[PDB]
């Protein structure tokens, strides 16, 4: 029953997505439910050492972006190919 | 001592301390497993 | 406040169980010797006397968030505390069975239902009458301050003879 934050982001391109990974930020998305795929950025280290808890996935998520919280549950993970930091997470609205 | 590196813990007062750049396990009643390096 | 079962569980239970006791005896630890207290909970359960060994670190805050027995002299340093809610003379008699194995003169001061009692005056209990007459000899302020303190001076010949 974990608490994270995010900032608003929209990217399609090679130059933009790399300029997150260069600097230790990465993207994720909250699909279905009442609303469209919402693209967000997260931090590398907020999920690695700010947390080493099974609750992120086993329990509901408070996710703050522009004062919004909708309740969310986790979906499949994409991981970096050269470090144990997070390359991308997918999410479904709950 | 033995010439081995990678220091191990073998008793309660393994303090493990680096003297002039080689790490020795400490012994005070049991130097039967004291090392030189790590 | 709380983080443990062995230390923090014992700040809210040291001077409240003994503000709760009819007699208590507040003595010096690491000078009565810890062993001797274990081979004397032999006789101690066959009297109804409870004994805890307790640090000045649990006593230094028994005064705030929690009430205390109006004593602070025997709270400083290492501390044993022996105490009963049944037959008040027994907490102190138990404190004389100590000299066989180490030494009985280890009392600093005492508390009785809340009133400070000095160590010269509390051996009147450790004689061990019937409980009732032990209560008659000493109380907290409800009677001992009122009528007992004149007995104390006219009977300076012995401690057993001083009464409440």
């Amino acid at each position: 029953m974990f608490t994270i934050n995010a900032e608003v982001r929209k990217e399609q391109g090679k130059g933009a997505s790399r300029r997150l990974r260069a600097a230790n930020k990465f993207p994720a998305i909250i699909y279905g439910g009442k609303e469209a795929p919402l693209a967000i950025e997260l931090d590398h280290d907020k999920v690695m050492n700010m947390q080493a808890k099974a609750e992120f996935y086993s329990e509901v998520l408070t996710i703050v972006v522009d004062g919004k919280e909708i309740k969310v549950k986790a979906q499949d993970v994409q991981r970096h190919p050269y470090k144990p930091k997070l390359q991308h997470i997918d999410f479904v609205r709950a | 001592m033995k010439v081995r590196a990678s220091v191990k813990k073998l008793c309660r007062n393994c303090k493990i301390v680096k003297r002039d750049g080689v790490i020795r396990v400490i012994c005070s009643a049991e130097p039967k497993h004291k090392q030189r390096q790590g | 406040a709380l983080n443990l079962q062995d230390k923090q569980a014992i700040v809210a239970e040291v001077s409240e169980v003994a503000k709760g006791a009819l007699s208590a005896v507040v003595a010096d630890s690491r000078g009565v010797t810890v062993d001797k207290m274990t081979e004397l909970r032999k006789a101690g359960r066959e009297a109804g006397v409870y004994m805890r060994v307790v640090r000045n670190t649990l006593l230094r805050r028994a005064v705030e968030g929690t009430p205390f027995e109006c004593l602070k002299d025997a709270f400083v340093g290492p501390t044993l505390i022996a105490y009963s809610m049944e037959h008040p003379g027994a907490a102190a008699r138990l404190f004389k069975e100590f000299a066989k194995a180490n030494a009985k003169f280890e009392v600093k001061a005492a508390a009785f239902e809340g009133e400070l009692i000095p160590a010269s005056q509390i051996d009147r209990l450790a004689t061990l009458p019937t409980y009732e007459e032990a209560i008659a000899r000493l109380m907290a302020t409800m009677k001992e301050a009122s009528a007992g303190k004149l007995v104390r001076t006219l009977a300076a010949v012995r401690d057993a003879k001083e009464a409440a």
């Binding site: - | 012994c27 005070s28 009643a29 049991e30 130097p31 039967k32 | -």
Partner: protein
């Protein structure tokens, strides 16, 4: 360092003085004693000096427990000193005092003239056991340290001058 942040355990009747990274212990009893501790941060207070973190040759508090320890060390030095009961195990080796000089050997019939600096003296009840006298915690062991540095004790059965930490530690041979 938890111990950089101590009561320093020096009374006010020992007026200890600051001199940059050079610290000098002064007051009643003993002799004039000192300590050298570099790469530290020093507040003076008055005589219970407060030690904190620095990077220069320290890693961050590396010396700050040290300085605190060493100032009290010097203070215990002037008020009474430290231990001094020095001893040897084996025969022929000597530890026997004759005046200014303490006579010892590797096994042999001639000594190696181990001699004391000023402000420390010694004498001996028996030719194995030594009682050392003076007014600093550094010096009584410092003369003790050079005294064991000509014949060392021997790992199984001691054969030489034994003080503080020593070479004879003993070890088992059977069980199983």
């Amino acid at each position: 360092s938890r111990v950089a942040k101590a009561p320093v355990v020096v009374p006010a009747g020992v007026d200890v003085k600051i001199n940059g990274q050079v610290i000098t212990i002064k007051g009643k009893n003993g002799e004039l004693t000192r300590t050298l501790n570099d790469a530290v941060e020093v507040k003076h207070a008055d005589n219970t000096l407060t030690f904190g973190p620095r990077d220069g040759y320290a890693d961050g508090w590396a010396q700050a427990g040290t300085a605190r320890a060493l100032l009290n060390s010097m203070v215990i030095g002037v008020t009474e000193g430290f231990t001094k009961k020095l001893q040897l195990v084996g025969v022929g080796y000597r530890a026997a005092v004759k005046g200014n000089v303490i006579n010892l050997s590797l096994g042999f019939s001639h000594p190696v003239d181990h001699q004391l600096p000023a402000g420390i003296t010694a004498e001996c009840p028996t030719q194995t056991e030594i009682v050392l006298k003076g007014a600093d915690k550094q010096v009584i062991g410092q003369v003790a340290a050079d005294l064991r540095a000509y014949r060392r004790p021997e790992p199984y059965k001691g054969k030489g001058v034994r003080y503080a930490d020593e070479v004879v530690r003993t070890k088992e041979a059977k069980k199983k």
